[PDB]
Design brief:
The structure holds 3 protein chains of 3 kinds.
Chain A lengths: L2 E5 L3 E2 L5 E8 L9 E7 L6 E6 L5 E3 L7 E6 L4 E6 L8 E9 L2 E5 L3 E5 L8 E5 L10 E11 L5 E4 L8 E3 L3 E2 L5 E10 L9 E6 L4 E6 L3
Parallel strand pairs in A: 2-11
Antiparallel strand pairs in A: 1-3, 3-8, 4-5, 4-9, 5-6, 7-8, 9-10, 9-11, 12-13, 13-17, 14-18, 15-17, 16-17, 18-19
Chain B lengths: L3 E4 L2 E5 L4 E11 L3 E6 L6 E5 L3 E2 L7 E14 L8 E7 L6 E2 L3 E6 L6 E5 L3 H4 L3 E11 L4 E7 L2 E2 L4 E5 L9 E10 H5 L3 E8 L6 E6 L3
Chain C lengths: L31 H4 L4 H5 L12 H26 L6 H19 L8 H13 L5 H10 L2 H8 L1 H6 L10 H4 L5 H28 L2 E2 L3 E2 H4 L1 H34 L10 H8 L5 H8 L4 H7 L2
Antiparallel strand pairs in C: 1-2
Helix pairs in contact in C: 3-4, 3-7, 4-7, 4-10, 10-12, 10-13
Classes of the chains: A mainly beta, B mainly beta, C mainly alpha.
PDB class: immune system
Keywords: Broadly-neutralising human monoclonal antibody, immune system
Assembly: trimeric
Chain lengths: 218, 213, 299
């Protein structure tokens, strides 16, 4: 089962070089039939093809970026990499690596958000949104946690280590006046399960390598 | 360099409805067109290649037509998980270029919000800030009003709202309103309330609390 | 008296020695395994005197079964001898493909229908008749014999693996009624993914590398320019073979009253049969749009 995963910093200061690497699992990068590429998606903008490489080394770029782009291949490590130099805020985008079937990109990676800023990385602060021990709707109670003051914005919320999935809503983050992001994850559960079942939200801020887990009790 | 033009930019249909997106090419592509589906919190996926070939594994409702400059993606029967943004892409010659994308939205029946009010944690209060959260859950449509009330006074410019994308199962929205004020300012008031007004609510729903349960 | 029609069950040729025949009957492509299917006893029926002088049907059908068990038994032994007595996936697949072809012969649903096969069909027409319900009578006879013939093909591995025998080849799978064209696409695909890495490997030894990192070896170099011409011969044939098999499939799929779980197009069969199959990679390969042909064969 071939799979793609991007890795690399999510924050770049302006004029600095942008590096990301894709790593091929479940198969080889030494494919005699496929190319391997990078695609970008700037906020509120359409998709942009960056470039592709064949395992031999043969490279193809978009004239749009050919000036400051370089895509390498490490057959040894089963990876291919992107380096986009002298970045500006026009380069803040979601970067995907894909399997390029001579135009038909038939497998994509999950994507990684790279924010170009001079602002420093800041880890989140997690607070519980405790279930109202008082009111309820007869059968269902809501609970969740507040993920406050982080940057850049990439921050995922998991529930009971991935076990609870139904009724989970993780809101889009909102940029506060402080210049830091803030969001909330929320899950509705049966009122009857409180005290019985344990609820733990698993916050993950990869840019600042932060992993907070919090017990949400009434 | 070739230019791809998608029409419309956005469209709303009901589950079961027949929906069609179009991709217009600047120059002629010899049916070297690919169609991608980008569902929320998911990487784009290849649906159709060579203008009309339906990739194995992808649903039977997806159909691609055209050659030359005018192409069409057709969804025969819209489903709740078809809420996604659809992108067209040529591969006639380097560079590969995409269209801007078409956002497909699901029409649904009215659904009234379930309101919840969360007081700020004691650990955040010891940090000197107070975040009061109002949760409007699983409603349709997106238009709701959340008016905050501290001791029956209306609040202005001290709250922020966030909205969920249409749920890929029930095609509903969820919203959070967050009143943020100082520990000092949170302490000078007792009753905190959020009044929710929606198309599906006969009378406004008011969820409230006091400093100390 | 020298007037005796006979087709001998000879030693199986090396795998891929002869390619798929897309010329004999132009609507289909025949695998060399099928041409070599053991039919000695089935063919011999042309020479049997009218023993009808003192017989009936139930008997004819039973005679047929005994003769078919013998041809299946020989086929099983010869296929094992082909795989060098290795009791693996490759052997099980051939047992499946050949068992399948005997069934289509009996059912009168086989696609060779020429020469000795036309002779075997006429022989089966003599036993069962030519009325509207004759084909179903044949189909019925197959559904009551199909497992005995598979156990007949396996006789060789059994006899050779006495008690030190496991069920690597499963009955339920081999005796599964599927259309001929579906089974052959499975067999073709399997052959394809074997031929392909070799074909790219030879194209590499002559063409991989640049004339000082700037110019392709395929531009000014004749040992390479040659490898491209010969790989092109192979990929041209496989493309033709595929389009032929694909068309037959379309026709057959429509006629068929039985639904095949998951099978919609020929691509679905390969995605089912082969490990790690990608239809975009396949489509590009057969249409010379693959990385290798571009990177090693175009200036």
């Amino acid at each position: 089962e071939v799979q793609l995963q991007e890795s690399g910093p999510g924050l770049v200061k302006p004029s600095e070089t942008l590096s990301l690497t894709c790593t091929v699992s479940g198969g080889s990068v030494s494919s005699s039939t496929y190319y391997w590429g990078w695609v970008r998606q700037p906020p509120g903008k359409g998709l942009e093809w960056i470039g592709s490489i064949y395992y031999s080394g043969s490279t193809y770029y978009n004239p749009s970026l050919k000036s400051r782009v370089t895509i390498s291949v490490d057959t040894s490590k089963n990876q291919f990499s992107l380096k986009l130099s002298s970045v500006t805020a026009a380069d803040t985008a979601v970067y995907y690596c894909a399997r390029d079937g001579t135009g038909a990109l038939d497998l994509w990676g999950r994507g990684t958000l790279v924010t170009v800023s001079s602002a420093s990385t800041k880890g989140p602060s997690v607070f519980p949104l405790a279930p109202s021990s008082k009111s309820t709707s007869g059968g269902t109670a809501a609970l969740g946690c507040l993920v406050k003051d982080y940057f850049p914005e990439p921050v995922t919320v998991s529930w009971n280590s991935g076990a609870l999935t139904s009724g989970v809503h993780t809101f889009p983050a909102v940029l506060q006046s402080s210049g830091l992001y803030s969001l909330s994850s929320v899950v509705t559960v049966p009122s009857s399960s409180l005290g019985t079942q344990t609820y733990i939200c698993n916050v993950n801020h990869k840019p600042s390598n932060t992993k907070v887990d919090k017990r949400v009790e009434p | 360099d070739i230019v791809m033009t998608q029409s419309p930019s956005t469209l709303s249909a009901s589950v079961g409805d027949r929906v069609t997106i179009t991709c217009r090419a600047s120059q002629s592509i010899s049916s070297w067109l690919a169609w991608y589906q980008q569902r929320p919190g998911k990487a784009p996926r290849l649906l159709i290649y060579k203008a009309s070939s339906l990739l194995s594994g992808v649903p039977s409702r997806f159909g691609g037509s055209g050659s030359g400059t005018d192409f069409t993606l057709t969804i025969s029967s819209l489903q709740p998980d078809d809420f996604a943004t659809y992108h067209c892409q040529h591969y006639n010659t380097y560079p590969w270029t995409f269209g801007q994308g078409t956002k497909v939205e699901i029409k649904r029946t009215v659904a009234a919000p379930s309101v919840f009010i969360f007081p700020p944690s004691d650990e955040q209060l010891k940090s000197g800030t107070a975040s009061v959260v109002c949760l409007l859950n699983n409603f349709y449509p997106r238009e709701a009003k959340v008016q905050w009330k501290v001791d029956n006074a209306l609040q202005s410019g001290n709250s922020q709202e966030s909205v969920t994308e249409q749920d890929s199962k029930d095609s509903t929205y969820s919203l959070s309103s967050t009143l943020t004020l100082s520990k000092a300012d949170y302490e000078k008031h007792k009753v905190y309330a959020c009044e929710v007004t929606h198309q599906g609510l006969s009378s406004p729903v008011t969820k409230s609390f006091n400093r100390g349960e | 008296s020298g007037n005796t029609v006979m087709k001998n069950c000879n030693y199986k040729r090396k795998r891929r020695e002869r390619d798929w025949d897309c010329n004999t009957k132009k609507d289909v492509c025949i695998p060399d395994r099928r041409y070599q299917l053991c039919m000695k006893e089935l063919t011999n029926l042309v020479n049997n005197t009218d023993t009808n002088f003192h017989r009936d049907i139930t008997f004819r059908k039973l005679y047929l079964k005994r003769k078919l068990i013998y041809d299946a038994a020989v086929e099983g032994d010869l296929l094992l001898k082909l795989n060098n007595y290795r009791y693996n996936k490759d052997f099980c697949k051939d047992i499946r493909w050949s068992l399948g072809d005997f069934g289509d012969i009996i059912m009168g649903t086989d696609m060779e229908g020429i020469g000795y096969s036309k002779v075997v069909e006429n022989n089966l027409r003599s036993i069962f008749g030519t009325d509207e319900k004759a084909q179903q009578r044949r189909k019925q006879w197959w559904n009551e014999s199909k497992a005995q013939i598979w156990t007949a093909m396996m006789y060789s591995v059994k006899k050779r693996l006495k008690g030190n025998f496991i069920w690597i080849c499963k009955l339920n799978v081999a005796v599964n009624i599927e259309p001929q064209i579906y089974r052959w696409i499975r067999e073709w695909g399997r052959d394809y993914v074997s031929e392909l890495p070799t074909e790219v490997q030879k194209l590499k030894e002559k063409c991989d590398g640049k004339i000082n990192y700037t110019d392709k070896k395929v531009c000014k170099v004749p040992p390479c320019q040659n490898a491209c011409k010969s790989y092109d011969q192979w990929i041209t044939r496989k493309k033709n073979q595929w389009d032929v098999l694909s068309n037959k499939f379309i026709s057959v799929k429509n006629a068929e009253k039985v639904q095949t779980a998951g099978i919609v197009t020929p691509y679905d069969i390969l995605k089912q049969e082969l490990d790690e199959f990608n239809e975009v990679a396949f489509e590009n390969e057969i249409n010379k749009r693959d990385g290798a042909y571009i990177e090693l064969c175009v200036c």
